[PDB]
Every structure is written in C-alpha cells, then in structure tokens.
Amino acid sequence: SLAEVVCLEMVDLPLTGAQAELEGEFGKKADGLLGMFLKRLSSQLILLQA
Amino acid sequence: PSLWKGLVGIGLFALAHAAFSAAQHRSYMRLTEKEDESLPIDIVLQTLLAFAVTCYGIVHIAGEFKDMDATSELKNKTFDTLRNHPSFYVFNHRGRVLFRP
C-alpha cells in the first residue's frame, strides 16, 4: 500500500523518562525562596541517586 | 585564621552547585521552549551570595600587606647580629678550646 503515499508529516517522539521530570518541576513559582531551594535540592538528590 | 581558607572552599563549592542548577534550568528551557527567558530567583541569589562570601574570603587569603618604610623590620635588628659577617668567619676563638674538641 505504501507504494502510493499522498501526504506525510513528521511528529516528534515523546520525551524520554530521564527528561520527563525537567518539565514538571518547572513552573511552580513558589513565593518563598526556601521552597524553591527545597525542591531544587530534592531534584538534585533524585538525580544523584539515579 | 586558617578557617578563612576553608571558607573560600565552600564558596567555590556553592558556586559549583549554582552551575549545576543553572545547567538543569537550561535543560528546563530546552524541554519547555516557552517565553520565560529568565533564571530562577533562587539560583541568582545563591550565585550572588556565593560570590560575595568567596570574594570576602579571597581578600583575606591574599595575605598581609607589608610596610614601605625600610626602617620597619630593621628596628629590631640589634648590633649583635649585623656584625657577624658569615663569609668571614674565624674559628680561632675560645669556643673550640672551651667546648669538647
């Protein structure tokens, strides 16, 4: 059937597991800097464990 | 004191950590592609504070200044020292005979 192709488009593949969390932690916009430091250090420990 | 040296170390470490954070945040953008174009306040505040403490430590680590007036360190030089002339030593004194040969 692929002998006669009419139209095609390229769709990007989904983000990998090692990069999925980089779009979830961002955008929180916490009012206090302590919360930002806490989540940043938690992400750092998660990456270190990985 | 010597702890100043240790202080500067942690300062560099702090700066190093900032780098990591910045790198991660860049990846954030490289996966969000939104019109943010701004660093988190936490990372810039941490970088600036680390810079301040590290520079303050470095200023101490640089050392101690020395006075220009040449009569500063020469004040305590008694005449019993300048007269020795180490090149022109003579060993025909009472020291050898008095002491064990």
Side-chain angles (χ1 to χ4, degrees), chain B residues 60-81:
Chain B
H60 273 80
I61 308 304
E64 334 166 39
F65 284 101
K66 267 199 273 202
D67 35 29
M68 326 164 29
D69 42 350
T71 85
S72 88
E73 94 292 313
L74 199 131
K75 146 181 179 124
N76 231 15
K77 221 174 199 168
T78 166
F79 200 49
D80 278 289
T81 283

Side-chain angles (χ1 to χ4, degrees), chain A residues 15 19-23 25-27 33-38 40-41 43-44 47, chain B residues 17-18 20-21 24-25 27-29 31-32 34 38 40-43 45-46:
Chain A
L15 308 160
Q19 292 170 7
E21 303 302 319
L22 304 180
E23 82 147 52
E25 193 89 317
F26 193 50
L33 85 167
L34 182 55
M36 330 259 282
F37 190 76
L38 253 59
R40 190 160 52 92
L41 78 93
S43 58
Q44 198 259 354
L47 292 150
Chain B
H17 192 295
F20 266 49
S21 295
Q24 283 160 26
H25 171 87
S27 277
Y28 279 18
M29 170 86 100
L31 294 181
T32 293
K34 84 156 44 191
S38 196
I41 305 302
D42 166 326
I43 88 162
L45 193 74
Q46 200 258 19

